[PDB]
């Protein structure tokens, strides 16, 4: 998801 | 995506000065913040390309970071302490503007800002 260091976070 | 040019660290058209307050900002304030475990995100301009932040420089029009501040202090770029203090406050505020309130980067910035405030509370009288 958008944001710092969050591209690979999905929940 | 491209990053903007970084903030200038020297400018021949801008008058330069040294004061004991600016020396304190280098030797006490910056030094304390730079060595902190949470300094690393703030030691250079935000790299919006590598961080995949295509909107960073759409939102943040006054970027600032401690690498820039450090160079400014080393270059005697500032006229007075207030200008430097403003750069630190811009840096912290940018982080809070861009990132969500609960984000880890925001907690890092807050830790650094707390220390900043504790040190600037003892900024010496100019002399």
Numbering used by the authors:
A (entry chain B): 582 to 592
B (entry chain A): 42 to 168
Copy out sentences from the published article reporting this entry, exactly as the authors wrote them.
Bromo and extra-terminal (BET) proteins provide a recruitment platform initiated by the recognition of acetylated lysines (Kac) by their tandem bromodomains (BRD, Dhalluin et al., 1999, Jacobson et al., 2000, Owen et al., 2000). BETs, like all of the 42 human BRD-containing proteins, contain additional interaction domains that recruit other proteins to the acetylated protein target, forming complex assemblies and contributing to processes such as chromatin remodeling and transcription. Direct targeting of BET-BRDs by small-molecule inhibitors such as the high-affinity and pan-BET specificity thienodiazepine (+)-JQ1 (hereafter referred to as JQ1) enables their displacement from Kac. Multiple decreased interactors harbor sequences that can directly associate with BET-BRDs in canonical or new BRD-mediated structural binding modes, and we propose that the tandem BRDs present in each BET protein may be capable of simultaneously recruiting both a histone and a second interactor.
SRPK1 contains a Kac-YS-K motif, and its paralog, SRPK2, has been reported as a BRD3 interactor in the BioGRID database. We crystallized an SRPK1 K585ac/K588ac peptide with BRD4/BD1 and found K585ac inserted within the cavity together with Y586, while the K588ac remained outside the cavity. Importantly, validation of binding by ITC revealed similar affinities for Kac-Y epitopes compared to other Kac-XX-Kac motifs (BRD4/BD1 versus SRPK1 or H4, KD = ∼9.9 μM). In addition, both H4 and SRPK1 peptides were competitively displaced by JQ1 in ALPHAScreen assays, supporting that binding occurs within the BRD Kac cavity in solution. Further evaluation of binding by ITC suggested, however, that these interactions with BRD4 have different thermodynamic properties, with H4 association driven by enthalpic contributions (consistent with multiple electrostatic interactions present in the structural model, a larger surface presented to the protein and a negative change in heat capacity, ΔCp), while SRPK1 association was also driven by hydrophobic and entropic contributions (consistent with a positive change in ΔCp). Taken together, our data suggest that Kac-Y motifs can compensate for the absence of a second Kac, resulting in a similar structural template that fits within the volume of BET BRD sites. Phosphorylation on the longer linker on histone H3 (Kac-X4-Kac; the second Kac being outside of the BRD) affects BET binding, potentially linking cellular signaling events to epigenetic circuits. Together with the discovery of binding to a new Kac-Y motif (>16,000 KY motifs are encoded in the human proteome), we suggest that the BET BRDs can contact a larger target space than previously appreciated.
